Amino acid sequence: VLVQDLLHPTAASEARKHKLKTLVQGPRSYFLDVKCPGCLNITTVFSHAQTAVTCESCSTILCTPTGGKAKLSEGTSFRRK
Amino acid sequence: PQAKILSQAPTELELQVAQAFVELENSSPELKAELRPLQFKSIREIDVAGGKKALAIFVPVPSLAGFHKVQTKLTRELEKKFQDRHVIFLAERRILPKPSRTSRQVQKRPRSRTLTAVHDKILEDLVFPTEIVGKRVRYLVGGNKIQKVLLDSKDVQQIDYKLESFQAVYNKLTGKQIVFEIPS
Amino acid sequence: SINQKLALVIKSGKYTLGYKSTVKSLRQGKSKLIIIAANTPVLRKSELEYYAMLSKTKVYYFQGGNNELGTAVGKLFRVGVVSILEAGDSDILTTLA
Amino acid sequence: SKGNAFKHKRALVEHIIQAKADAQREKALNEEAEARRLKNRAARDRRAQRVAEKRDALLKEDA
Amino acid sequence: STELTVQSERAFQKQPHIFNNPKVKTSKRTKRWYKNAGLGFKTPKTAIEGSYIDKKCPFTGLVSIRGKILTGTVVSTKMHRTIVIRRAYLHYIPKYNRYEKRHKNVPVHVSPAFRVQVGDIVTVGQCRPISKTVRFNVVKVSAAAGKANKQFAKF
Amino acid sequence: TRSSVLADALNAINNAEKTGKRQVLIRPSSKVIIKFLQVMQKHGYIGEFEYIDDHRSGKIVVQLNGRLNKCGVISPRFNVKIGDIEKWTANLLPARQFGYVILTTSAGIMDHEEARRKHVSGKILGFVY
Amino acid sequence: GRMHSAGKGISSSAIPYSRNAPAWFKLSSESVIEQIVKYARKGLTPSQIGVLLRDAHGVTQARVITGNKIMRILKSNGLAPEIPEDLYYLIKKAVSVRKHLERNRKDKDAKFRLILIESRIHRLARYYRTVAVLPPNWKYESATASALVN
Ligand SMILES: [Mg+2]
Ligand SMILES: [Mg+2]
Ligand SMILES: [Mg+2]
């Protein structure tokens, strides 16, 4: 194209790009506040948690490890950050 | 009372700020263990190009954590009673010169005492409440060097009016040009 | 799994190695768990089992001989039976294995 | 000694005296280092950080 | 070197022409001669209060340091009172405008006032021919830290 | 592996000039790259250049005015004496009138003509014309 | 990339640009520190402690929350191991392969892989002796090497 603004790319372009290949690299992962069904305790959970995170009440599963993002256990409620 | 919170004798002007502190402490629910043992070092006066003046407060380095918890309330109250002023909090960070080849060996200079790190630390404490999300340096074709600071749009309402005063103080304490910009 | 729990109790807990110390610990009631190697003689195995039945202490059967048991407890001499006097930070007692 | 290179009784005696001198010197400097770190740091951190470092720093000069 | 059989030889080891008078009893029991070699090399305290003789020592012996002052890395301490130092340097080859690593092994006489190990950086000074191959004496050693403190067993 | 970050930067600029682009990204933006670009900026061979500060090593976007023919490095950084500067300028530069051999010297990083005025010499970094 | 393979995958973690983070974290820095020690009492490696803090807690990085890194905290608290973690896991892998090779003579692929693992072991141990983490004359014995991993 021979003329473009490398300092101000469109936000859609950076969203499509790889996490390491943006102008400043950064994680596309996040953290979650999960509401377990049994009680109303808050356990912070990583998006790519890669382990069966547990609370103190529902001590079986709060999320399920996968190849990517963790799979929350199908009965919980969550909010970002 | 005044000499308790001031930690220096000269000059007149900061004694009013010390007088401001001892009279704003009539907020006993928050004064206990969050406002009393917190004393500063000195006040610097810098003229903003826009027609106003800037108040710089020099803080002991292991006291910053106290000031940051109460900075937002202390700033707004001090500015209210001291209209036509913009007040900031700057840590007193010692800068050691870079050792020369012929120079003799003092103890190894830590990275916190380098001029680059202190100036970046000056900038972080200058714009305290909002987090810096990116720095740019524009090397102008004429040989100039303008640094650009990006700010996360959250809480920028507390620093909109102080952006020009931020540039005036940083240019005063470093001799380096700087601009601000808030992505949204 | 088992070898890490054995590693943690050696670094952080109390133990004794060998047949004469294990029997003495079982006789004194001071043992919580005994681990027996695979190639332990059956007369010794049946006798260490029988003291542990009287002591009412759990017995774990180590899949591996005295050479593997000695290696698993950080030693380089052959160890036939290990008794755990008390665990440290290891969950070897709490875990079902 | 089961190996070679102790040619006779005198050669082994000299080796023992040399080994005793080297081991004692290594043991002396190791205890000297150990007594230095305990005396000058462990005890100093116990007392020269609590009893009087909170006396001349910010409290009594606050008057 | 205040110990380990100073008189371990067939000849009585002594500093020449230093007379220990047995009539007058000075409160030192041994008259010890020494000097400073010059060129800003401090005489070590081990040479001051030691009991060794070492006629080839630059502080207590009969040899004088004059000429070239070099610096090398100790690579061998197996001889008695003699070491080998490695002097590395780059040799410029004009045709390729580049350098090549080169080295020389220099045998050096070490005084018992010094304790050198393999790997110590040592400063040597030129003297008269000590032996067939030795023309240098140790005058300064640079064993300061060694970085071995972290190389020990932990609790 | 990345042996010379300066060679990586100048190669990116050369490929951008040949393709006719007016901008180029540079990673990882050493001090030598900044110092080399400032000599280019001083003599008009490039325009603006900005430094993206990620906390790793930085990135650079250079504005290209199309006036640059070639900018290479001389690896290894040979030792250059005062008498040898003219020999290097004869070999690398197209004409005696323009172009610059860039040197790293204890007086600073500078072009070959500034090295003559200050009567300093050191190691060669590259060239520009 | 890939010291001992033809792979060129990137597969890294892009850590945030912020060094003070993330302003929703409310746990104390000290609270994280004795949580690090608590996991270290449990026998977990510094990598495992960092993973657990990231998942169960909201500790994005111990360095951007506490004053310094996890292994530094363990060494400061006196819980550093005899050998570093990555070297330990390499010797553990080499012990597994050598144990497999004893029963499988004809596994020449395993023999090739063991040389690659022991090349990484000797390279890493040489660095640790150089940076003085490991004592001088420390050597991976390859015969009694299973003693130091069990
Ligand atoms: Mg490869
Ligand atoms: Mg290779
Ligand atoms: Mg790659």
From Swiss-Prot, chain B:
Localization per record: Cytoplasm; Nucleus, Nucleolus
Q: Which domain of life is it from?
A: Eukaryota
Major localisation: cytoplasm
Keyword annotations = Acetylation, Cytoplasm, Isopeptide bond, Nucleus, Ribonucleoprotein, Ribosomal protein, Ribosome biogenesis, rRNA processing, Ubl conjugation
Q: How is it modified after translation?
A: N-terminally acetylated by acetyltransferase NatA.
Sequence position, cross-link Glycyl lysine isopeptide (Lys-Gly) (interchain with G-Cter in ubiquitin): K80, K81, K121
Extract one GO cellular component term from the record: cytosol
Its signal peptide is: none
Gene Ontology biological process terms in this record: cytoplasmic translation; ribosomal small subunit biogenesis; ribosome biogenesis; rRNA processing
GO MF, one annotated term: structural constituent of ribosome
Q: How does it assemble?
A: Component of the small ribosomal subunit (SSU). Mature yeast ribosomes consist of a small (40S) and a large (60S) subunit. The 40S small subunit contains 1 molecule of ribosomal RNA (18S rRNA) and 33 different proteins (encoded by 57 genes). The large 60S subunit contains 3 rRNA molecules (25S, 5.8S and 5S rRNA) and 46 different proteins (encoded by 81 genes). Interacts with snoRNA U3. uS11 interacts with MPP10. Component of the ribosomal small subunit (SSU) processome composed of at least 40 protein subunits and snoRNA U3.
Family classification: Belongs to the eukaryotic ribosomal protein eS7 family.
Other information: Present with 41000 molecules/cell in log phase SD medium. There are 2 genes for eS7 in yeast.
PANTHER family per UniProt: 40S RIBOSOMAL PROTEIN S7, SMALL RIBOSOMAL SUBUNIT PROTEIN ES7
What name does the UniProt record give this protein? Small ribosomal subunit protein eS7A
Q: Which species is the source of this protein?
A: Saccharomyces cerevisiae (strain ATCC 204508 / S288c)
Curated annotation (Swiss-Prot), chain C:
Show the Pfam families listed in the entry: Ribosomal_L7Ae
Per the annotation, which location comes first and is thus the protein's main one? cytoplasm
Q: Which domain of life is it from?
A: Eukaryota
**Which controlled-vocabulary keywords does the entry list?**
Cytoplasm, Isopeptide bond, Ribonucleoprotein, Ribosomal protein, Ubl conjugation
Subcellular localization(s) per the UniProt record: Cytoplasm
Q: A single GO CC term, please?
A: cytoplasm
Crosslink position(s): Glycyl lysine isopeptide (Lys-Gly) (interchain with G-Cter in ubiquitin): K14, K45, K75
Biological process annotations from GO: cytoplasmic translation; negative regulation of mRNA splicing, via spliceosome; rRNA processing
Q: Which SUPFAM superfamilies match?
A: L30e-like (SSF55315)
- UniProt GO molecular function: pre-mRNA 5'-splice site binding; RNA binding; structural constituent of ribosome
The record, for NCBIfam families, names:
PRK01018.1
What is the purpose of this protein? Component of the ribosome, a large ribonucleoprotein complex responsible for the synthesis of proteins in the cell. The small ribosomal subunit (SSU) binds messenger RNAs (mRNAs) and translates the encoded message by selecting cognate aminoacyl-transfer RNA (tRNA) molecules. The large subunit (LSU) contains the ribosomal catalytic site termed the peptidyl transferase center (PTC), which catalyzes the formation of peptide bonds, thereby polymerizing the amino acids delivered by tRNAs into a polypeptide chain.
The similarity comment for this entry is: Belongs to the eukaryotic ribosomal protein eL30 family.
Further information: Present with 59300 molecules/cell in log phase SD medium.
PANTHER family xref list: RIBOSOMAL PROTEIN L30
Descriptive protein name: Large ribosomal subunit protein eL30
Organism of this sequence: Saccharomyces cerevisiae (strain ATCC 204508 / S288c)
Name the encoding gene, please.
RPL30
From Swiss-Prot, chain D:
- Superkingdom of the source species: Eukaryota
Crosslink Glycyl lysine isopeptide (Lys-Gly) (interchain with G-Cter in ubiquitin): position given as K20, K60
- Subcellular location per the Swiss-Prot or TrEMBL entry: Cytoplasm
**What does UniProt give as the signal peptide span?**
none
Q: Which portions of the sequence form the region Disordered? A: 38-63
Q: Which family does it belong to?
A: Belongs to the eukaryotic ribosomal protein eL19 family.
Any further remark recorded for this protein: Present with 97700 molecules/cell in log phase SD medium.
The UniProt subunit note reads as follows: Component of the large ribosomal subunit (LSU). Mature yeast ribosomes consist of a small (40S) and a large (60S) subunit. The 40S small subunit contains 1 molecule of ribosomal RNA (18S rRNA) and 33 different proteins (encoded by 57 genes). The large 60S subunit contains 3 rRNA molecules (25S, 5.8S and 5S rRNA) and 46 different proteins (encoded by 81 genes). eL19 lies in close proximity to the binding site for eukaryotic initiation factor eIF4G.
Role description: Component of the ribosome, a large ribonucleoprotein complex responsible for the synthesis of proteins in the cell. The small ribosomal subunit (SSU) binds messenger RNAs (mRNAs) and translates the encoded message by selecting cognate aminoacyl-transfer RNA (tRNA) molecules. The large subunit (LSU) contains the ribosomal catalytic site termed the peptidyl transferase center (PTC), which catalyzes the formation of peptide bonds, thereby polymerizing the amino acids delivered by tRNAs into a polypeptide chain.
Name of this chain's protein: Large ribosomal subunit protein eL19A
From Swiss-Prot, chain E:
Please report the PTM annotation for this entry: N-terminally acetylated by acetyltransferase NatA.
Q: Does the keyword RNA-binding apply?
A: yes
Q: What are the GO BP annotations of this UniProt entry?
A: maturation of SSU-rRNA from tricistronic rRNA transcript (SSU-rRNA, 5.8S rRNA, LSU-rRNA); ribosomal small subunit assembly; translation
Alphabetic keyword roster: Acetylation, Cytoplasm, Isopeptide bond, Ribonucleoprotein, Ribosomal protein, RNA-binding, rRNA-binding, Ubl conjugation
Q: What else is known?
A: There are 2 genes for uS17 in yeast.
The protein's matches in PANTHER family, at most eight in alphabetical order, are given as: 40S RIBOSOMAL PROTEIN S11 FAMILY MEMBER (PTHR10744), 40S RIBOSOMAL PROTEIN S11-RELATED (PTHR10744:SF9)
Q: What name is this protein filed under?
A: Small ribosomal subunit protein uS17A
Q: Which organism is it from?
A: Saccharomyces cerevisiae (strain ATCC 204508 / S288c)
